[PDB]
């Protein structure tokens, strides 16, 4: 048998339903989610890290000139200094006074730390959504396996067959371009591998962590070695990646709405709460017993003992019944006024049973069906003492969940009396018109 | 930090995150006098019950000045076919019941 | 690279090829690649057949 419905996109809140095969006893059904992961499709563009500029040994011609060509290196620099006359240990290095030449070339490359901490640049696209469901039905225990949230694919669990419907919202916390540095994820824009302004984010752009070609502009410039000392000095702007790690705001796993915890190894967005998920479950035909082998109850009267507003199961009710035989049959409230803590009861011959429920109304007007027989329950509820709890609400608050009986009496008085005060006015002009018409003849 | 019924989470230092939700306690009492009813709904809704309070007195003011533009017009048609000719005997139903101005002469 | 940002050095010049005026692509959302020819085909999506 196939049962279709719509479940909401909440994780810890179970969905309860009562399937009704004709000619057979009803079977309780319980679907619960564990995970909900949105997995966008990403492709790496470039990584970035702190640079490390190496300087080769300069050549010191004693008297002459040595020019350099152009080398295929990122941010390569050449500048020839004339007339240096350097000193080393053990006397002066050169002889030809006031006519000398120093090479002093410099070159920018990736640091050794770039294999460990590096920000990875991605663009995302819409990909797969998958979840993890928990299923029980009848007398079968809990079974769980991860499904795919597309209408087309079925995933069997136990002996059933579940088709989780598509999500009704295409919302995703990720932007078009993201930066994944270390543990956290940032919503950011890139200089698109061509540009980089030497001090913000893209002063070193490498397409792969082991790539050979490298882009780097760090405003490298060489300076004159002074006072006859053999060294190659240079001034350049500091690293933009080192600056970005100071001046970055909050990561996406602290800003994302709906409580989406962001994971990393497939770059997921776990456990969001938006929209609703349709369902369809193929219950096996061997789980349905014949209706004649079940108790048939009658003369049900339900009185709600104590009720309250609270997020947990704060309502207690008792049902007095009378049954033909002793057995088990599930209970379920089809309305949204209350949810039921219990799933089934053990019956006898003309006894009683009690159950726990949670609601948001002052006056609950729900009904529940036990042993394919229904009974209505009414009552009153009280405000709870607790101000803040640490668990989500089991129920769903509606638009008219706050209006009491006394507040609706003032709604009807303020509407009924003032509308009828115009009806008295409108019937007054239709009477004196009739009186003046009868004065005409 | 203001916590609504949707929830709020906070991380302090290197501690794991903690989530808290707000219940619907309130301060007032809905089953009582009209000053007690409004106070309870003002704390629960501080954004909707100040509009519906102004709307309900806007409709009442409109419906009151609509009716007295029609009750006084009707009473102005009681007097104009009787006060013109004072010799006509005014019936006893129109003196007090149907319209307010009583008999004389 | 055809985007208005990345420059390329062709000899001693520097060319920045701007973005295309149309975002038209011949491929559909789902394609099937058999041999050396592509097809604009839909999918049974791994659960159906």
Curated annotation (Swiss-Prot), chain B:
It is found in: Virion membrane; Host cell membrane. Coiled coil: none annotated. The chain crosses the membrane at residues 50-70. It is a single-pass type I membrane protein. It comes from the Viruses. Residues 71-105 are cytoplasmic. A lipid is attached at residues 78, 98-99 (S-palmitoyl cysteine). Residues 78-98 are annotated as: Transient transmembrane before p62-6K protein processing. Palmitoylated via thioester bonds. These palmitoylations may induce disruption of the C-terminus transmembrane. This would result in the reorientation of E2 C-terminus from lumenal to cytoplasmic side. N-glycosylated. Processing of the precursor of protein E3/E2 into E2 and E3 results in a heterodimer of the spike glycoproteins E2 and E1. Spike at virion surface are constituted of three E2-E1 heterodimers. Interacts with 6K protein. Plays a role in viral attachment to target host cell, by binding to the cell receptor. Synthesized as a p62 precursor which is processed by furin at the cell membrane just before virion budding, giving rise to E2-E1 heterodimer. The p62-E1 heterodimer is stable, whereas E2-E1 is unstable and dissociate at low pH. p62 is processed at the last step, presumably to avoid E1 fusion activation before its final export to cell surface. This is Spike glycoprotein E2. The chain holds residues 640 to 744 of 1242 of the full protein.
């Amino acid at each position: 048998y196939e049962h279709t419905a719509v479940m909401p996109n909440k994780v810890g809140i179970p969905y309860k339903a009562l399937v009704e095969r004709p000619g057979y006893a009803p079977v309780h059904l319980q679907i619960q989610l564990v995970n909900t992961r949105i997995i966008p499709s990403t492709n790496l563009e470039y990584i970035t890290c702190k640079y490390k500029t190496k300087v080769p040994s300069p050549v010191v011609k004693c008297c002459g000139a040595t020019q350099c060509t152009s080398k295929p290196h990122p941010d390569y620099q050449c500048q020839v200094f004339s007339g240096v006359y350097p000193f080393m240990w053990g006397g002066a290095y050169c002889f030809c006074d006031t006519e000398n030449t120093q090479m002093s070339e410099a070159y920018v490359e990736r640091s050794e730390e770039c294999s460990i901490d590096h920000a990875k640049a991605y663009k995302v696209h819409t990909g797969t959504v998958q979840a993890m469901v928990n299923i029980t039905y009848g007398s079968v225990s809990w079974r769980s396996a991860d499904v795919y949230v597309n209408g087309e694919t079925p995933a069997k669990i136990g002996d059933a067959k579940l088709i989780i419907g598509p999500l009704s919202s295409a919302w995703s916390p990720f932007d078009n371009k993201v930066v994944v540095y270390g543990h956290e994820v940032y919503n950011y824009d890139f200089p698109e591998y061509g540009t980089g302004k030497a001090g913000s984010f893209g002063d070193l752009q490498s397409r792969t962590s082991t790539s050979n070609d490298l882009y780097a502009n760090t405003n490298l410039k060489l300076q004159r070695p002074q006072a006859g000392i053999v060294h190659t000095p240079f001034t350049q702007v500091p690293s933009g990646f080192e600056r970005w790690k100071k001046d970055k705001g909050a990561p996406l796993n602290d800003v994302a709405p709906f409580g989406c915890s962001i994971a990393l190894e497939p770059l997921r967005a776990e456990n969001c709460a938006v929209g609703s998920i349709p369902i369809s479950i193929d219950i096996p035909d061997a789980a349905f017993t014949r209706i004649s082998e079940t108790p048939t109850v009658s003369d049900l009267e339900c009185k709600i003992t104590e009720c309250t507003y609270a997020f947990d199961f704060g309502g207690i009710a008792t049902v007095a019944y009378k049954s033909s035989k002793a057995g088990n049959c599930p209970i379920h409230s089809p309305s949204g006024v209350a949810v039921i803590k219990e799933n089934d009861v053990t019956l006898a011959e003309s006894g009683s049973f009690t159950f726990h429920f949670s609601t948001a109304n002052i006056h609950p007007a729900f009904k529940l069906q036990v042993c394919t027989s229904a009974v209505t329950c009414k009552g009153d509820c009280k405000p709870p003492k607790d101000h803040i709890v640490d668990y989500p609400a089991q129920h769903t608050e509606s638009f008219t969940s706050a209006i009491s009986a006394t507040a609706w009496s003032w709604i009807k008085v303020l509407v009924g009396g003032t509308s009828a005060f115009i009806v008295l006015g409108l019937i007054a002009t239709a009477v004196v018109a009739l009186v003046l018409f009868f004065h005409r003849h | 930090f203001t916590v609504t019924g949707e929830g709020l989470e906070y991380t302090w230092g290197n501690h794991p995150p903690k989530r808290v939700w707000a219940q619907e306690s309130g301060e007032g009492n809905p089953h009582g006098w009209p000053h007690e009813v409004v106070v309870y709904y003002y704390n629960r809704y501080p954004l909707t019950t100040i509009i519906g309070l102004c709307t309900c007195v806007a409709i009442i003011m409109v419906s009151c000045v609509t009716s007295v533009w029609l009750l006084c017009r009707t009473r102005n048609l009681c007097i104009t076919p009787y006060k013109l000719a004072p010799n006509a005997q005014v019936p006893i139903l129109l003196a007090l019941l149907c319209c307010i101005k009583p008999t004389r002469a």
